[PDB]
């Protein structure tokens, strides 16, 4: 879920971003980016939770009425013009195990060093599974957070697919 | 807000591995280890002849390549098409039907020598 503070901040970011779409010009946006700031500072020191919830509740409706129908979206963000564009080139690392030895001989250094990562992952798995058992309640993991490695020489649990993930801008 | 001490520790430990992995993706100078080839003599000539990049160097190279392209992609194909049209297509009825040329008053027919009578004198006007 989201706490009351988080909604206020998330609403604050959305209002500025949609306001920046209505203004275009920086000087105009700056002028109205500070008037909107005052609308939050004015009620910043509120103490009544019930009143604060009402203010947020009415603020959201005021935002939905004034939102830009075509708000600016960063190209790589969900909904942008470059979102998921390079997924075509993201190839998983396991595809290299099927390479023909003729293709594998063109990169002797890369595959001699990729093998070391193979050994590190292979020798670190047992300790990986062992740590998760001892640091998990009897019922089961109640959250998706993963603990860091405790001892020295132990890699973080469940690290392979976060470390070896495809690059953001491949070929 | 803010990462808890365990969150910072994990993000930092993962960060070290990520950089080490990304570093290991860099090709060494030797790579790629291309196998032996069958380099042709014509290719050999142009490499040394064009290693200086002189303007009179590539001008010959540009003319040489365009002449080859014209011979193999325009002259050869048009030879084949003309042979096809002339001796195989145009030998069959109603294969290439040309709209008959326009005959205007005052013209001469190259095939019978007749002269088309001119038009009647225009009555009058200006502008």
């Amino acid at each position: 879920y989201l706490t009351h503070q988080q909604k206020v901040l998330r609403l604050y970011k959305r209002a500025l971003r949609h306001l920046e779409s209505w203004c275009i010009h920086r000087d105009k946006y700056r002028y109205f980016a500070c008037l909107l700031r005052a609308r939050f500072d004015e009620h910043k020191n509120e103490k009544d939770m019930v009143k604060a919830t009402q203010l947020l509740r009415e603020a959201e409706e005021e935002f939905w009425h004034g939102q830009h129908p075509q708000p600016y979206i960063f190209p790589e963000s969900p909904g942008g013009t470059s979102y998921e564009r390079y997924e075509c080139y993201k190839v998983p690392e396991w595809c290299l195990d099927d390479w023909h030895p003729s293709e594998k001989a063109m990169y002797p250094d890369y595959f001699a060093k990729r093998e070391q990562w193979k050994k590190l992952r292979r020798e670190s798995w047992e300790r990986e599974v062992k740590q998760l058992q001892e640091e998990t309640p009897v019922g089961g993991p109640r959250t998706e957070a993963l603990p860091p490695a405790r001892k020295q020489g132990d890699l973080p649990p469940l690290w392979w697919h976060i470390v070896t993930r495809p690059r953001e801008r491949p070929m | 807000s803010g990462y808890t001490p365990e969150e910072k520790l994990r993000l930092q430990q993962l960060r070290e591995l990520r950089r080490r992995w990304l570093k290991d993706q860099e090709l060494s100078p030797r790579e790629p280890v291309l196998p032996p080839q069958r380099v042709s003599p014509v290719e050999r000539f142009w490499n040394k002849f064009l290693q200086d990049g002189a303007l009179w160097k590539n001008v010959i190279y540009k003319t040489y390549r365009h002449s080859i392209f014209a011979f193999t992609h325009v002259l050869i194909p048009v030879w084949i098409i003309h042979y096809y049209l002339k001796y195989h297509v145009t030998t069959k009825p109603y294969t290439i039907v040309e709209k008959k040329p326009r005959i205007f008053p005052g013209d001469t027919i190259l095939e019978t020598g007749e002269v088309i009578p001119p038009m009647k004198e225009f009555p009058d006007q200006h502008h």
């Binding site: 190839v91 595809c95 099927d98 390479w99 003729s102 293709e103 | -």
Partner: peptide
């Protein structure tokens, strides 16, 4: 600086 490109096997 000439990073390695992960591709599927094109030999076959």
């Amino acid at each position: 600086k000439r990073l390695f490109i992960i591709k599927p096997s094109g030999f076959y």
